[PDB]
């Protein structure tokens, strides 16, 4: 993911492509003219083209292109399909997990001693740098990194174009001390795990200017999304193409929900754009993250709910937003009964609350009375069209009610969560739910690691949690939950 430059202007991007690139060279960067937006800068016929990528929270929407779950998925699509031929690699180490810019040696030794383990390492500024590694069961070793005539070295041997190239080389070819100690660079020092009780302190520190600390942390998490390019073959099958709301936003094959007992006369009846999400990766405290139904996928949706024994559905979109259909109406009007293929649904009662509507549904298979179960649909109706709510209170009160409903039901299957694409708002609600559940069981004195949790959810469905605004909202929601305990 070296084609992503987090700190360059459009002029710097043009100058980089015109002087260090060739026709077909490209890079992506965050927008400066509209923070929250991105730009794909591409060299074609000796000139540079700047293409806008927008993300208001649901997907990356490339101008003159398609809608994607991650920037890595976007780039992989066009590199395997204006030509994107040559990534122009970024030498900036700001978004590396192990880079701690202006941090002192005293503080760095305190962090490796209190939070490190064998092979924990960090790189900090001295124009020179220091590589600090903990080894043992123990001790801290400091390796001086010289910057001489724009290249990096540890005092001998090879000279690197970037700290990234230097760190990767010494991860592959470890330094050995003359008495035998292997300076193993096993893992970056963990600085994001916090005690839940100290959430306020961390939010305060992250709200300070780095763009704030939140931006730096979120972009270091995005840098790791190239580790998550898992296969999505099933969603690409001709037979499944029109079952996807967005052509290129697909479920990973390894976690997709497989639909069994399909119409024997239907060649492909096992697909739905949905993934099982398991915390720390029981059916009960698991989730199904899915897209908003299409008219042709309503029956598949109900086959999924029935098969998985799901008793709670969380809908985080209106049916229509900004004049566009985000989810078809897959449930009957209040008091009505409808058949969706082999599935029969009665809408028993609707209850309106400030931020949401609850629909008590009875789902059963046609011809089998004894299969009836109640499915509780919580429909969050006040999420803004773009961005996130200004206050997490409403979302928390809603999740608290959803949690208690699910907890009250013996052997309930995973909670189904959906929005439009099923990755932005969906991923945001699931992550908040996972984090608050840890504070429920383990109490205020528990460890929480927001980016670790999100990377874990993102390994089960593409792009869960889309934006820096949602990333900050997750911290704000955890903070508010702890503050009202
Ligand atoms: C100051 C700095 N340059 C930015 C903040 N920082 C970190 C570190 N680690 C993560 C992390 C944690 C768990 C899983 C994943 Cl995948 C990630 Cl990437 C993160 N998001 N930010 C430290 C370096």
Yes or no: say if 395 and 380 are a contact pair by the CB < 8 Å rule.
yes
Kind and range of the H or E run holding 476: helix 468-483
- 423 annotated as a binding-site residue: yes
146 close to 157: Cβ distance less than 8 angstroms:
no
Residue 219, ligand 1, Cβ within 6 A: no
- Find the 100 Cα to ligand 1 centroid distance in Å: 10
Taking the C-alpha atoms of residue 28 and residue 13, their distance in angstroms, rounded to an integer, is 9
> How far out from the chain centre does Cα 104 lie?
31
Q: In 316-355, which ranges are E strands?
A: 320-321, 324-325, 337-340, 343-352
Fold of 1-95: SHC Adaptor Protein (3.30.505)
Angstrom distance (rounded) from CA 106 to CA 434:
35
CA–CA gap between residue 190 and residue 122 (Å, rounded): 9
| 8 A C-beta contact, residue 185 and residue 174 | yes
Q: How far apart are the first and last CA of the chain?
A: 41
Q: Return the structure tokens found at 120.
A: 């924990």
* Of 418, 417, 382, nearest in space to 403 by CA: 417
Helices (H), 59-129: 71-79, 105-115
CB 454 within 8 A of CB 464: yes
How is residue 426 written in tokens? 């969906």
Which residues are paired to 357 by β-bridges?
352, 379
Annotated binding-site residue? 420: yes
- Domain ranges within the chain, ordered by starting residue: 1-95, 96-188, 189-485
Q: Is 385 part of any known ligand binding site?
A: yes
Structure tokens at 332: 């009957």
Residue appearing with tokens 């001790």: 139
Cα 387 to ligand 1 centroid, rounded to whole Å: 23
Q: Is 373 in the pocket of ligand 1 (CB under 6 A)?
A: no
Task: Judge whether 452 and 193 are in contact, CB under 8 Å.
Answer: yes
Interruptions in the chain after residues (C–N over 2.5 Å): 81, 126, 137, 210, 281
- Residues paired with residue 153 on neighbouring β-strands, in sequence order: 146
The set of residues, in sequence order, having a beta carbon less than 8 Å from that of 196 and lying 6+ positions away, is 438, 439, 442, 443, 444, 445, 446, 447, 448, 478, 482
Identify the active-site residue in 90, 293, 327, 419. Answer: 419
Q: 205 CA distance to ligand 1 centroid (A)? A: 15
Is the distance from the beta carbon of residue 130 to the nearest atom of ligand 1 less than 6 Å?
no
192 lines ligand 1 (CB under 6 A): yes
d(CA 99, CA 130): 10
Measure the CA–CA gap between 323 and 382, rounded to whole angstroms: 16
CA proximity to 415, closest of 319, 274, 293, 295: 274
The helix/strand/coil state of 351 is strand
Q: Residue whose CA is closest, atom 18 of ligand 1?
A: 221
Active site residue 90: no
Q: Which fold has domain 189-485?
A: 3.90.190
CA of 268 to the centre of ligand 1 (A): 41
Centre of ligand 1 to C-alpha 269, Å, is 41
Residue 331, phi then psi, degrees to nearest 5:
-125, 155
Q: Which one, of 46, 4, 45, lies nearest residue 28 by Cα?
A: 4
* Distance (Å) from CA 173 to ligand 1 centroid: 24
Residue of the CA atom closest to atom 14 of ligand 1: 452
Beta bridge partners of 29: 39
Q: Which ranges in 425-467 belong to alpha helices (H)?
A: 425-442, 450-458
What CATH code would you report for 96-188?
3.30.505.10
Q: Does the C-beta of 224 come closer than 6 Å to ligand 1?
A: yes
CB 354 within 8 A of CB 394: yes
Is 174 buried (19+), middle (13-18) or exposed (0-12) by CB count in 10 A?
A: middle
Closest residue (by CA) to atom 7 of ligand 1?
97
Do 96-188 and 189-485 have matching folds? no
Q: Cα–Cα–Cα angle for 385, 390, 395, nearest 5°?
A: 80
Spatial separation of the C-alpha atoms in residues 205 and 224, rounded to whole Å: 23
**Residues 40 and 26: beta-carbon distance below 8 Å:** yes
What is the C-alpha to C-alpha distance for residues 440 and 346, in angstroms, rounded to an integer? 34
463 is in an annotated binding site: no
Of residues 319, 308, 310, 362, the one with CA closest to residue 340? 362
Scanning 144-273, the segments in alpha helix (DSSP H) are 163-172, 199-207, 213-223, 233-236
215 vs 221: CA distance, rounded Å: 10
- Please give the number of the atom of ligand 1 that sits closest to the Cα of 93: 3
Q: Is there a binding annotation on residue 421?
A: yes
Q: For residues 425 and 419, is the Cβ–Cβ distance under 8 A? A: yes
Rounded to 5 degrees, φ, ψ at 409 are -100, 115
Phi/psi-derived region of residue 22, left when phi > 0, alpha when psi is between -120 and 50, beta in every other case: beta
Pocket test for ligand 1, best of 451, 452, 459 (most atoms within 8 A of CB): 451
User: In testing the pocket of ligand 1, which one of 123, 187, 192, 435 has its CB within 8 Å of the most ligand atoms?
Assistant: 192
Which residue's C-alpha comes closest to atom 17 of ligand 1? 221
| 422 marked as binding residue | yes
d(CA 218, CA 221): 5
Residue 301: half-sphere exposure toward Cβ, Cα within 13 Å: 25
Distance 468 CA to ligand 1 centre (A): 14
- Residues composing the chain: 485
Among 221, 225, 447, 468, which residue has the most ligand 1 atoms within 8 Å of its CB, making it the best to mutate? 221
């Amino acid at each position: 993911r070296r084609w992503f430059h987090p700190n360059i202007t459009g002029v710097e991007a043009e100058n980089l492509l015109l002087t260090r690139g060739v026709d077909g060279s490209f890079l992506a960067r965050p927008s400066k003219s509209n923070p929250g937006d991105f730009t794909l800068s591409v060299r074609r016929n000796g000139a540079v083209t700047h293409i806008k990528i927008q993300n208001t929270g649901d997907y990356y929407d490339l101008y003159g292109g398609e809608k994607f779950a991650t920037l890595a998925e976007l780039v992989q699509y066009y590199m395997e399909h204006i030509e994107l031929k040559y990534p122009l690699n970024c030498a900036d180490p700001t978004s590396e997990r192990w880079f701690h810019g202006h941090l002192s040696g005293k503080e760095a030794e305190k962090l490796l001693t209190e939070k490190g383990k064998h092979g924990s390492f960090l790189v900090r500024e001295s124009g020179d740098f220091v590589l600090s590694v903990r080894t043992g069961d123990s001790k801290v070793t400091h390796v001086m990194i010289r910057c001489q005539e724009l290249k990096y070295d540890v005092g001998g041997g090879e000279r690197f174009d970037s700290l990234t190239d230097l760190v990767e080389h010494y991860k592959k070819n470890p330094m050995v001390e003359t008495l035998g100690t292997v300076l193993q660079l096993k893992q970056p020092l963990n600085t994001t795990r916090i005690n839940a009780a100290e959430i306020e302190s961390r939010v305060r520190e992250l709200s300070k200017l780095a763009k704030q600390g939140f931006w730096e942390e979120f972009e270091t998490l995005q840098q790791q999304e190239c580790k998550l390019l898992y296969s999505r073959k099933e969603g690409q099958r001709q037979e499944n193409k029109n079952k996807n709301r967005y052509k290129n936003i697909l479920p990973f094959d390894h976690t997709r929900v497989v639909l069994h007992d399909g119409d024997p006369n239907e060649p492909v009846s096992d697909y739905i754009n949905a993934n099982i999400i398991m915390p720390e990766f029981k059916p009960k405290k698991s989730y199904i993250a899915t897209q908003g139904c299409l008219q042709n996928t309503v029956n598949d949706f109900w086959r999924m709910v029935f098969q998985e024994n799901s008793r709670v559905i969380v809908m985080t979109t209106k049916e229509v937003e900004r004049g566009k259909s985000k989810c078809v109406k897959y449930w009957p009007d209040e008091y009505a009964l409808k058949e969706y293929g082999v599935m029969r649904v009665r809408n028993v009662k609707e209850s309106a609350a400030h931020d949401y509507t609850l629909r008590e549904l009875k789902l059963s298979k046609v011809g089998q009375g004894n299969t009836e179960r109640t499915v509780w649909q919580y429909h969050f109706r006040t999420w803004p069209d773009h961005g996130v709510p200004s206050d997490p209170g409403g979302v928390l009160d809603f999740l608290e009610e959803v949690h208690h409903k699910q907890e009250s039901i013996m052997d309930a299957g995973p909670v189904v969560v959906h929005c439009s694409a099923g990755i932005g708002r969906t991923g945001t609600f699931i992550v908040i739910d996972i984090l608050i559940d840890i504070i429920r069981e383990k109490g205020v004195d528990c460890d929480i690691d927001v980016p670790k949790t999100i990377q874990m959810v993102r390994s089960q469905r593409s792009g869960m949690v889309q934006t820096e605004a949602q990333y900050r909202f997750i911290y704000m929601a955890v903070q508010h939950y702890i503050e009202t305990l």
